[PDB]
Amino acid sequence: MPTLLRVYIDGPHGMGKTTTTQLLVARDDIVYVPEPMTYWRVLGASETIANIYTTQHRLDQGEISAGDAAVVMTSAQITMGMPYAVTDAVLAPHIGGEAPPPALTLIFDRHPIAALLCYPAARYLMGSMTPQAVLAFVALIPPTLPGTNIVLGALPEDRHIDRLAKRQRPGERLDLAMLAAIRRVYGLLANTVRYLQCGGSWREDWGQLSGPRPHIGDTLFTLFRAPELLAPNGDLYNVFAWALDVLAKRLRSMHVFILDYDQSPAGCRDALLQLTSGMVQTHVTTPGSIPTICDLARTFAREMGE
Amino acid sequence: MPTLLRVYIDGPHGMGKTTTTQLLVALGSRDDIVYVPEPMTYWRVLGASETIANIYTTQHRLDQGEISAGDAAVVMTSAQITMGMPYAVTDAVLAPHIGGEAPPPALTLIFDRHPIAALLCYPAARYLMGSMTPQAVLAFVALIPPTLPGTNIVLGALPEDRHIDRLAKRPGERLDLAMLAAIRRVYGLLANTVRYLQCGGSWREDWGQLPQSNAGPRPHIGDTLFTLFRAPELLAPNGDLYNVFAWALDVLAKRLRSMHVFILDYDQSPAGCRDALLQLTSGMVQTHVTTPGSIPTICDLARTFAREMGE
Ligand SMILES: C#Cc1cn([C@@H]2O[C@H](CO)[C@@H](O)C2(F)F)c(=O)[nH]c1=O
Ligand SMILES: C#Cc1cn([C@@H]2O[C@H](CO)[C@@H](O)C2(F)F)c(=O)[nH]c1=O
């Protein structure tokens, strides 16, 4: 059966992700799946991004409670992740085991974990989502398929602020606190994958949060030493501990690649191209999978891309 | 390999599901059948504060016109996410233990509700009540976990008059007969949807045409869950579904079609329901487990869950 390469370009917004990749299919055997802006602004709800930034701004000003903001943020994040969740689910049966040239390369703008883990966790750090909601999203992260190659960004903070200022989505507000939270989350994400792959056991190391791989205090696990999640004696409730077991399973089999964005758009493009030589390809499951996947991807772009 | 029997008792609230589940479990030896309760403690305390009360209060304030549909939707959507969390995690932790479909089972697990109750049925019912968008319902559907082998779901049958009587007597709940009608309709649609799919129905082929299961002829698509999603919000200018929503229905078909549905008549005494459920288990699908230590592991998981979150 023919081979497929899936490449998810992810990481904090405002680094230059949607430019870099736009230049990458810029063709028959590569398809670019862009961010589903139309879903966010129109199809799923009205101006979800505006809704998100306005809610945080009003929380910050003290015009609404943490409680009101959390229910708003939570349902908004549901809208945000929907196109990623449907796409993953319809693609899943087509994905075979690990596998030469690929018959088809899909380059996605973001992986489901952006809306089902990273953004929720950042909003938690922003005081506008409960950690219990975050772990509800985590519990729903689809099982990690073979060949899940995820590209995360590296960019010094000052330069990132400069780029973000020019890359504001419709309805977005330039929020340096959110920028720092989302950068911390993705930093912790990269660390967490490494911790897990080198054989780290969160349950074994959990005691260190109260005291060769990253320290657990430098992974996503540290975020869930939140008091909401803990019994009167300090123990994590089992239901949350199980969500963390799921988090561990999902993240461990991801293939992370770091893309230096502190260079020219053509440079970023070339660097992304270089990275592909180490990415994992899979077979598809049926002979008709390749054109079906192509049609899915192109229909997504056409209908939901800006 | 030793075998496992998983049975999810589901359907509208107020039918006697929870009692039936306990009665059935009380028949078995302690360590060959385990009860996985509604995570009431999660709903009331651990996940958020009094979520059930929040749900019913919000619907009421919508009905009274004290809040907008928009405000009700964001509360209802967040609350439904909270409702489903323990179901999702439990399914995710059980999944790698389950083998292919397959003497008495080494272990029987009786669940109070399947993940689809919180990820599909209640959201769909709330959408019918005007307190959730159909887009959000389809987001929940997109997130329904892959259907494990040997997913036996038992749904309820019960005359509406007896059901209403049962509810008006036997929290945070408020007596809402409109919601009762909605959730009864939704589970009836569900039963039909499984039968429709297993009879080879293709919603895309039948789209233009807009109970019981494991028996009978193929339902009309208008009597399945697919009919709920002919909503103006989901339709393109040309009048077809946007592809994104269409893909969510494809997921809906995929998840439901491999399920094994049974209908239990609740219009009888608690012991009657128990024995009826017991007879029904005879035609239910078991699975192998993936490791020998899966049986005790699964057992501990079920008991830990029950202890922490059961009422
Ligand atoms: C995927 C995704 C998400 C994107 N976004 C935002 O949408 C835009 C994506 O470019 C950007 O403003 C953002 F990244 F901040 C969210 O707020 N939440 C998400 O879950
Ligand atoms: C599972 C479940 C759910 C239960 N419930 C309610 O919880 C209560 C106990 O089951 C009952 O009032 C109910 F079933 F209606 C919801 O409102 N939503 C759900 O998703």
Curated annotation (Swiss-Prot), chain B:
Used in molecular biology as a selectable marker to identify transfected eukaryotic cells. Used in cancer suicide gene therapy to selectively kill transformed cells. Its EC number is 2.7.1.21. Homodimer. The active site is at 38 (proton acceptor). Phosphorylates and thereby activates certain drugs like acyclovir (ACV), valacyclovir, and famciclovir to a toxic form, that leads to successful suppression of the infection, while the uninfected cell does not have this ability because it lacks TK. Mutations in thymidine kinase may induce HSV resistance to antiviral therapies in immunocompromised patients. The most frequently observed resistant strains are unable to express TK and are avirulent in animal models of disease. Keywords: ATP-binding, DNA synthesis, Early protein, Kinase, Nucleotide-binding, Transferase. Belongs to the herpesviridae thymidine kinase family. Catalyzes the transfer of the gamma-phospho group of ATP to thymidine to generate dTMP in the salvage pathway of pyrimidine synthesis. The dTMP serves as a substrate for DNA polymerase during viral DNA replication. Allows the virus to be reactivated and to grow in non-proliferative cells lacking a high concentration of phosphorylated nucleic acid precursors. InterPro entries: Herpes_TK, P-loop_NTPase. It catalyses: thymidine + ATP = dTMP + ADP + H(+). This is Thymidine kinase. The gene is TK. It is an enzyme of class 2 (transferase). SUPFAM superfamilies: P-loop containing nucleoside triphosphate hydrolases. GO terms for molecular function: ATP binding; thymidine kinase activity. GO terms for biological process: DNA biosynthetic process; TMP biosynthetic process. Pfam families: Herpes_TK. The keyword tRNA processing does not apply. It comes from the Viruses. Substrate binds at residues 56, 80. ATP binds at residues 11-18, 166.
